[PDB]
């Protein structure tokens, strides 16, 4: 699934992860460390919304 950062528009794609910040591809948003933040703007996880119909 994909989640959008409501502040800056960055999309966290679980298939892509965030390798440069220690997140391997396939890591679910709920599995992200509590201290993980948007890599673009710094926003906490609370500011993300799941993109699901
Ligand atoms: Fe952001």
From Swiss-Prot:
Cofactor: Fe(3+)
Temperature remarks: Extremely thermostable, being unaffected after incubation for 24 hours at 95 degrees Celsius.
Swiss-Prot/TrEMBL GO biological process terms: alkane catabolic process
Coiled coil stretches, renumbered: none
One MF annotation (Gene Ontology) recorded for this entry: iron ion binding
Cofactor note: Binds 1 Fe(3+) ion per subunit.
Keyword hit for Metal-binding: yes
Entry keyword set: Electron transport, Iron, Metal-binding, Transport
Highest taxon of source: Archaea
Binding sites annotated in the UniProt record for Fe cation: 5, 8, 38, 41
Statement: the UniProt record of this protein carries the keyword Iron: yes
Ranges where the Rubredoxin-like domain occurs: 1-51
Function: Rubredoxin is a small nonheme, iron protein lacking acid-labile sulfide. Its single Fe, chelated to 4 Cys, functions as an electron acceptor and may also stabilize the conformation of the molecule.
Family: Belongs to the rubredoxin family.
Name this polypeptide is given: Rubredoxin
Organism: Pyrococcus furiosus (strain ATCC 43587 / DSM 3638 / JCM 8422 / Vc1)
Gene: rub
